[PDB]
Amino acid sequence: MRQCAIYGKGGIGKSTTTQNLVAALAEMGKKVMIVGCDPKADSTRLILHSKAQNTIMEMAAEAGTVEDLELEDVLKAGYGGVKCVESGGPEPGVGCAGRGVITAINFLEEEGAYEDDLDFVFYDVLGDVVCGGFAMPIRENKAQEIYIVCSGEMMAMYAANNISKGIVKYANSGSVRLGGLICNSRNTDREDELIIALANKLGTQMIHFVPRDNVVQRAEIRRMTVIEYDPKAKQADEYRALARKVVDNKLLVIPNPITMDELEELLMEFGI
Amino acid sequence: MSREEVESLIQEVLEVYPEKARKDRNKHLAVNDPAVTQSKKCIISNKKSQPGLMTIRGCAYAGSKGVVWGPIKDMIHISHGPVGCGQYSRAGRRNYYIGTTGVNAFVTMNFTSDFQEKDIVFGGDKKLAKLIDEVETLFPLNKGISVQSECPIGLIGDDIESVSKVKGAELSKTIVPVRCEGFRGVSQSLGHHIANDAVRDWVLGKRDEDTTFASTPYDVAIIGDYNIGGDAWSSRILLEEMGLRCVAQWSGDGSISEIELTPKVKLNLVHCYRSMNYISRHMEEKYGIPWMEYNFFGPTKTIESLRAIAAKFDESIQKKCEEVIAKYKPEWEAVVAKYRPRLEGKRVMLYIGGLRPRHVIGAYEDLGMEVVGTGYEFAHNDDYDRTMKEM
């Protein structure tokens, strides 16, 4: 069993990239588990074909406490035999927004949903802020591999740098490593090698470059994921190649943070 | 002038000392540079005195009993310990006051336990309680008791706080134990600190739950003026002529009631920063009373301080301040015209305790004199920060 997490700022195609990754992995006979560590209840809509999967926090609130919660109502199986967990946050302004992640991980460990011959577990974690229950997988050594989804925008690169700093802080206390930098395109000039340069600057390797196209939206309307919407699509094969590079990845390194002026100069000398 | 000459003079003077004494005393002598903002890189202060060098500093008992607590007139101050300490400080300081001594005022009287050998061997807590009873019977009109402890009190391990609490509960009296043993601290500064702590902990927080006193938006309290020869009264007449109301006086001609009523004051006017900055900071943090430092030495500093104090109130106070300045201008103009030609160009050297070396510089310069050398016995580094610019 391999524990991987997907981080990065919100709005960069994180959820759909993770969904295509796991569906592609399930196409090969592997069995995967999804834990949505994003307060938005959208991390598992494209593999279950639902309006919004009911979150663990909502069920715990409606069923009194989390001790009355049953595994069958929170663990839903979708296409390819994937196991789906959805960790909703509390209302804005009501305590820490990361209590849902801690509660869900503790519940999953208590009910034993990990040892059931799984091979891949994927934590779709919000990366805008690394704190509370969002830094909890790094704090508790839950996700051994971490991938950051970024683009050629200042916010995305800063989020990647912050997550790298968070990895560095807890490097000595466990085997939490940054596998690579997933790159998503917004149809801008000179973006692929910008991200390759960032990855080489902070020690990792670029995993795969995902271009922007309209097929994923047409699949999104049908509450459908791209691969099993149309397996012969070019983007479907690109997602398959991304999955192949993820599973056959053996480089695990400890990154080095880059300063604000370094990132500014890197962005400036590449034409943006 | 002759900065290099000054440094060579310092080096030559430091030659007689042994190595340790010379190395320590080199840090305490400096050549003034007014552009310096932090004194820590130029001079070092608030350190222990080198043994056997005839220092001029005092003890914490001098700074606590003799300086802060002593001027309070309606309280009775007991010099707990042997007889000499109270004897040498009796009426040696000219903190003026109004009252009938021995009946309702006790500034120039020496109360002491007069410790003997049996007091040292066995203790003086029972003797302290008996002394408090005798004070209560003999001086009924006293409005409070403060017990200033000398060296043997802390050296033999007496519990004067418990005695103070018990006697204050029994007699419904304000009894303030002050642990101002001479060996505590290197000079009178720690005595000031301990006296301020005692005032804060046992006196200040008494009229907190009452509101009988009628407050006024022009309420100020003089802090750090000890009425040495009547200075506090001149400052008071200058402030009242501006239209402000002075509620408290710390501590020259001061009363326990004024100290208790101080927290109901709009603005604190701190004259001596060194001795009463602690209680002013405590007041600002607790009751929200702003405090500001002023200078009433000479006409220039007096006018500047008067304008600064008036700037904190409405325009009527400013107009009254201008009226006062106009009224008092001819007097000091005549004084200057009479005395400046006789004193012009003379060079003066100063060495006083704290905040007086820098405060009186303006007064000397108003008559044409110039200060060529100054210093302190027990000022801290912030005082040197303040006095670098003025020299």
């Binding site: 609130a61 406490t65 009501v94 820490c96 990361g98 | -």
Partner: protein
């Protein structure tokens, strides 16, 4: 009951005298004395009021009841280890981390530390 509130936000630790057993909780004591503990709920389900309680008089430790709601909230923010949960279940002894809105003042001397952030970092 004597309570000493401590926080990096507070320039000085604050000593207060409280009446034990009141229906109003430690949150009432904190609010009366102007101690800024974040209270962001009225049902005791958030973790905003998380504090660290130290019993200064170790001999005078009073047995209490750890409510199921408080236990679940403390576990939700990861501030309740298994050993302390077992201790509360068997010996009826309080845990180190408590919730201000769910903490009943007892007749002892307490030190209440808070950092100004909600429970769960």
């Amino acid at each position: 009951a004597t309570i000493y509130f401590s926080s990096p936000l507070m320039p000085h630790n604050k000593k207060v005298q409280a009446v034990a057993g009141k229906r109003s909780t430690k949150k009432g004591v904190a609010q009366e004395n102007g101690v800024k503990i974040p209270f962001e709920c009225q049902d005791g389900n958030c973790g905003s009021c998380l504090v660290k309680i130290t019993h200064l008089d170790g001999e005078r430790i009073k047995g209490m009841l750890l409510t199921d709601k408080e236990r679940n909230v403390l576990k939700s923010v990861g501030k309740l280890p298994k050993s302390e949960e077992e201790r509360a279940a068997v010996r009826d002894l309080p845990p180190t981390y408590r919730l201000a809105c769910q903490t009943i003042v007892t007749d002892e001397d307490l030190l209440v530390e808070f950092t100004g952030e909600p429970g769960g970092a």
